[PDB]
């Protein structure tokens, strides 16, 4: 009797991820009291209006 095995495994798990997140905005105001100008022109991201 005689016997012989050859056995092989090869595995490749590549992966990747990316994310680009960009936000911009520019309130602009003319007229009105400078305190109300600054208080409104500051961009509230939850209410850009």
């Amino acid at each position: 009797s005689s016997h012989g095995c050859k056995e092989l495994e090869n595995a490749l798990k590549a992966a990747s991820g990316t994310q680009n997140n960009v936000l911009r905005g520019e309130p602009f105001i003319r007229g009105g009291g400078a305190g109300f100008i600054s208080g409104l022109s500051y961009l509230e991201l939850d209410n850009p209006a």
Binding site: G35, F36, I37, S38, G39, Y42
Partner: protein, 49 residues
């Protein structure tokens, strides 16, 4: 917070900074209505500057 932006802008009215400036060189103040020999003093300043 937009409150402190409003408060800052309100305070700026009373103690503002200078954002844009336009200037003339100081020798343009040396005027014969104030100083004798004013042309010579002026030209001296022009060099010294």
């Amino acid at each position: 917070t937009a409150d402190l932006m409003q408060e800052w802008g309100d305070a700026v009215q009373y103690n503002p900074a200078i954002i844009k400036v336009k200037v003339e060189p100081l020798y343009e103040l040396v005027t014969a209505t104030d100083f004798a020999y004013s042309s010579t003093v002026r030209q001296n300043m022009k060099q010294a500057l």
